[PDB]
RNA sequence: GGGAUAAGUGCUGAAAGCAUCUAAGCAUGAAGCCCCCCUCAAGAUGAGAUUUCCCAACUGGUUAUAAGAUCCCUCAAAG
RNA sequence: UUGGCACCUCGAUGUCGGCUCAUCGCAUCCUGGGGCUGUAGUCGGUCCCAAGGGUUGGGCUGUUCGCCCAUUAAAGCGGUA
RNA sequence: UAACUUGGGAGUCAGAACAUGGGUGAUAAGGUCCGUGUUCGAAAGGGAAACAGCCCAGACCACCAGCUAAGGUCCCAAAAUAUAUGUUAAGUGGAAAAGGAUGUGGCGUUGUGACACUGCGCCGAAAAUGUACCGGGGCUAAACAUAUUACCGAAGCUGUGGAUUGUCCUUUG
């Protein structure tokens, strides 16, 4: 059947973490601090949004 | 396992489509004049000048 | 010996438009699959498509006899285990009438390459409008 | 301006100056053959179609008399050692059409 | 209710009716409530 | 959280002066169905869209070059 | 299930119980919505609709089954050689 | 149009399904064993979707001819969206019983109700990859029952040509 679990390439997908918090917003550096840990490696693009929930 | 059925010589030549090998990626030496392999030292005459 | 055969050089194709208002699904689909398949010409040949180009409009106004509005389920399987999906003629006459009509008519055409190419002669539109004004669409009516 | 005749158990639509391949008539080479069974005439100026028509019967030359290409009839039964091959060449005559 | 393939009045106020094709008995004792004729 | 629903709950309502949830009509009603959440998705051959870029010279057309993309090379957050 | 037949396979279709991986049915064990109780309430019984997800760890025994210890919302019954 | 005798040469001794009469089995079995007929075996062609054994029908060969058999006529798919009259609302048609029941029509006997046949429908009606018990789309007539009209439909029959054997001698054709 399809959707069988077999070996292949892992990671890389677009993933979205919901309901995170904004610890602080530091101007003069344009940095934002988020409670937790977002996807991707360091130097990786991330897009922030206000939670739809 | 064993092949259940011999491979037709059409399927053989289809599988061998991508078995070609590519060009060497060569250039003309600006000193030798003869051909060199890019980013390599001229086998024919002398230096690399890079 | 002698018997006519139509060619790519020989065939001409006309456009038609037909309201589905007040129509039954199958009773329209039959009379329209006939025109698509092109067997009302005199120069019908089986191997080339002498059919016509049919436009259907007001596909939101077709009718169903009896209790088919809630019965008459359309099933379709996604080829994933347990991927069978279900809809009803009620939830499709209002949600996507121009696929109701398409499926009804395209189940009536033969399932070959000429049939696949003849099915795309059909242009189905809900409402009384269509972008095919530059074709001189002739007004046909059923029988 | 054509005519529908019936010659060899088969109707034929014919016009003036047309080659026709009919089954083997009884006429010889060259000599003209006139068909008597006409079923329809018309096309352009008159229209007479009836249970049959007496007159304007087609006058046609007898051009050639020969044997068609050889078909090889073959039929066999699988797993039962039973096959059979015949040859066949169907005789015909070709006529030229003079008058209607 | 009482879904049995034989619906019939037990007492005499129990009246036989149809709803959606299903045969039923409407009565005053809710015990007597029945359907599926 | 919305929409349509199952078993049920009905309102109105006659055929059948009555009653009657149903025949016409009108609601309500499930972890279920369809959306809402997340992901792939225009080879969706029905191949969709939006913005910006390039757009001449000789002979039906050909050519190379343009925008752009690679070959080759240094790499890793990728393999 | 225990069988009854002897239709395919004896120039070969590998048995049971576990493990890994599941998947499907519904004749629903749990959770969801209801009717009727000989339903005062907490808890039940029995029917009806419902298959979304869930449905444990050990002792003994090759064992399936099974009996037991301890929890659990529940420790479902079956098909898929 | 065979029958029989005398001689030469055999193959066959695992049969099957269906219809009907039985035994056995459980009024199970595509079970098993007998009688009876057919088809397959050794049979191609049309229909039953596909489907040795069911229905029609027995291929010498060729033709871009005609009439039909079973089976059919809305589209896939050749031919009736045929004609007359009625029934059925369940998608029954297009799977299944005991039992239940102010479903609906007909005729009938009763003193508005009750019953006797009755035609067609409803519930009873739950299974395992995917709708999945019309082949599909679709169908309220394209279902049912009855009754005349047409047409389609085979390698059947007829038409025309040809190839072989035979037997009459119309007339050695």
């Amino acid at each position: 059947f399809k959707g069988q679990k077999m070996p292949g390439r892992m990671g890389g997908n677009t993933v979205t973490v919901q309901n995170l918090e904004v610890v602080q917003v530091d101007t003069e550096n344009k940095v934002i601090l988020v409670k937790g840990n977002v996807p991707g490696p360091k130097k990786g693009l991330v897009e922030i949004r206000t939670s739809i929930k | 396992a064993v092949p259940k059925r011999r491979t037709s010589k059409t399927r053989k030549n289809k599988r061998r489509t991508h078995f070609k090998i590519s060009v060497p990626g060569m250039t003309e030496c600006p000193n030798c004049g003869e051909y060199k392999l890019s980013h390599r030292v001229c086998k024919n005459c002398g230096s690399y000048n890079g | 010996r002698q018997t006519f055969m139509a060619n790519e050089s020989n065939i001409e194709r006309k456009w038609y438009v037909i309201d589905a208002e007040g129509q039954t699904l199958g009773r329209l689909s039959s009379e329209v699959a006939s025109i698509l398949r092109g067997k009302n010409k005199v120069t019908y040949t089986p191997h080339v498509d002498t059919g016509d180009y049919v436009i259907v409009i007001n596909a939101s106004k077709i009718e169903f006899t009896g209790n088919k509005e809630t019965d008459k389920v359309y099933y379709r399987h996604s080829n994933h285990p347990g991927g069978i999906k279900s809809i009803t003629a009620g939830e499709l006459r209002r949600t996507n009438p121009e696929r109701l009509i398409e499926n009804s008519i395209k189940g009536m055409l033969p399932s070959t390459r000429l049939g696949e190419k003849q099915g795309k002669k059909l242009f189905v539109y809900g409402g009384a409008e269509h972008p095919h004004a530059a074709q001189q669409p002739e007004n046909y009516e059923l029988r | 301006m054509f005519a529908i005749i019936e010659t060899g158990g088969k109707q034929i639509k014919v016009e003036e100056g047309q080659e026709i391949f009919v089954e083997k008539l009884d006429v010889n080479e060259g000599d003209t053959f006139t068909f008597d069974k006409v079923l329809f005439v018309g096309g352009d100026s008159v229209k007479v179609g009836a249970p049959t028509v007496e007159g304007a019967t087609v006058t046609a030359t007898v051009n050639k008399q020969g044997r068609g290409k050889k078909i090889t009839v073959f039929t066999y039964k699988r797993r039962k050692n039973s096959k059979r091959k015949k040859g066949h060449r169907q005789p015909y005559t070709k006529l030229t059409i003079d008058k209607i | 209710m009482k879904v049995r393939p034989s619906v019939k009045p037990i007492c005499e106020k129990c009246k036989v009716i149809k709803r959606k094709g299903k045969v039923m008995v409407i009565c005053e004792n809710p015990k007597h409530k029945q359907r599926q004729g």
Side-chain angles (χ1 to χ4, degrees):
Chain A
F1 290 113
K2 292 182 179 70
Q4 185 67 41
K5 304 296 184 292
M6 292 181 181
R9 184 169 294 181
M10 185 182 175
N13 297 119
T14 300
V15 296
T16 183
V17 182
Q18 290 181 353
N19 297 119
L20 293 175
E21 293 85 4
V22 171
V23 174
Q24 297 173 358
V25 174
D26 195 358
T27 312
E28 284 89 10
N29 297 318
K30 298 299 294 295
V31 292
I32 307 171
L33 278 68
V34 172
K35 283 187 178 181
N37 44 11
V38 302
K42 293 188 284 185
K43 291 182 181 180
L45 176 68
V46 298
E47 58 268 18
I48 306 295
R49 289 179 175 89
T50 59
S51 179
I52 54 88
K53 293 185 178 183
Chain B
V2 295
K4 192 69 175 290
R5 180 65 55 196
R6 76 175 185 177
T7 293
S8 178
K9 64 185 180 293
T10 297
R11 193 183 297 274
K12 181 172 74 172
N13 293 321
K14 288 183 179 178
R15 182 183 66 246
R16 294 178 184 174
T17 299
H18 297 280
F19 185 65
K20 71 176 179 68
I21 64 170
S22 63
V23 298
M26 65 181 182
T27 62
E28 298 175 355
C29 180
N31 192 3
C32 299
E34 296 295 329
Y35 293 100
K36 66 187 287 290
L37 197 65
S38 66
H39 294 92
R40 274 73 173 173
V41 179
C42 189
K43 296 286 92 176
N44 295 322
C45 291
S47 295
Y48 175 68
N49 294 116
Chain C
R1 297 187 66 252
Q2 70 265 15
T3 294
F4 194 80
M5 290 295 172
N7 301 322
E8 184 171 359
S9 297
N10 206 167
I11 300 167
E12 66 94 23
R13 290 176 174 90
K14 295 305 295 179
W15 290 79
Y16 297 107
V17 65
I18 186 65
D19 287 336
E21 284 184 347
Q23 298 303 113
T24 304
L25 184 60
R27 303 281 177 173
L28 172 64
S29 299
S30 296
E31 188 75 25
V32 173
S34 295
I35 296 172
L36 290 170
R37 180 168 164 82
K39 69 188 296 183
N40 296 113
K41 306 289 184 67
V42 181
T43 307
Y44 176 76
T45 64
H47 57 274
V48 301
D49 54 355
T50 64
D52 291 327
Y53 287 146
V54 173
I55 299 170
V56 178
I57 67 171
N58 292 119
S60 299
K61 302 292 187 291
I62 47 85
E63 299 296 328
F64 288 101
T65 56
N67 291 320
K68 299 180 183 178
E69 190 269 327
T70 60
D71 296 332
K72 183 65 179 293
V73 173
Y74 293 99
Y75 296 97
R76 69 183 184 274
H77 197 273
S78 68
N79 288 110
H80 292 273
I84 188 164
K85 290 87 171 66
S86 178
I87 194 63
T88 62
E91 291 179 353
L92 187 64
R93 184 181 65 247
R94 76 182 69 185
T95 298
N96 193 0
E98 66 277 19
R99 185 179 66 80
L100 185 68
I101 300 296
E102 289 177 354
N103 294 119
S104 297
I105 297 168
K106 288 181 180 178
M108 292 180 180
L109 298 171
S111 299
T112 56
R113 304 188 187 186
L114 191 63
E116 294 177 354
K117 303 291 178 67
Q118 289 177 353
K120 62 183 72 176
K121 294 176 181 176
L122 180 65
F123 292 145
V124 185
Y125 295 106
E129 296 299 332
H130 58 83
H132 303 287
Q135 309 301 325
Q136 280 75 243
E138 294 177 350
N139 188 358
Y140 184 81
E141 293 188 356
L142 301 178
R143 65 183 179 86
Chain D
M1 180 64 205
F2 64 91
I4 295 167
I5 62 169
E6 184 175 3
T7 66
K10 286 179 255 74
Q11 280 70 6
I12 303 166
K13 183 172 75 70
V14 62
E15 294 179 354
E16 67 278 14
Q18 182 175 2
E19 296 174 354
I20 63 170
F21 292 91
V22 185
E23 289 183 352
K24 178 174 70 68
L25 296 178
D26 291 329
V27 294
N28 296 116
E29 288 290 326
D31 295 332
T32 61
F33 185 76
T34 61
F35 300 104
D36 297 332
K37 294 293 292 183
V38 60
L39 299 176
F40 187 84
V41 314
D44 60 358
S45 68
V46 299
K47 264 67 182 298
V48 298
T52 189
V53 176
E54 176 184 0
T57 61
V58 181
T59 298
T61 311
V62 177
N63 192 358
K64 186 178 178 69
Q65 183 175 0
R67 295 175 67 188
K69 64 185 75 173
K70 184 182 285 290
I71 68 167
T72 176
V73 178
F74 182 79
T75 188
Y76 78 107
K77 295 287 187 179
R78 66 185 175 183
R79 289 185 297 268
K80 278 70 181 175
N81 290 319
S82 175
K83 65 186 181 183
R84 182 179 64 89
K85 183 194 287 186
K86 307 301 289 183
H88 185 73
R89 290 173 64 92
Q90 184 66 33
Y92 67 93
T93 61
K94 67 174 290 187
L95 282 72
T96 301
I97 300 297
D98 296 334
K99 301 301 289 182
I100 295 171
Chain E
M1 76 291 288
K2 295 190 290 182
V3 174
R4 301 179 299 177
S6 69
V7 298
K8 61 182 71 172
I10 299 171
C11 73
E12 296 179 355
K13 298 183 293 296
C14 298
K15 67 191 287 186
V16 173
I17 198 64
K18 282 179 66 68
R19 294 179 180 175
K20 305 298 190 294
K22 296 292 182 181
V23 174
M24 299 182 184
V25 170
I26 309 167
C27 203
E28 291 182 354
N29 292 321
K31 292 180 182 177
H32 295 178
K33 192 186 266 78
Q34 301 173 358
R35 62 101 172 175
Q36 173 171 341

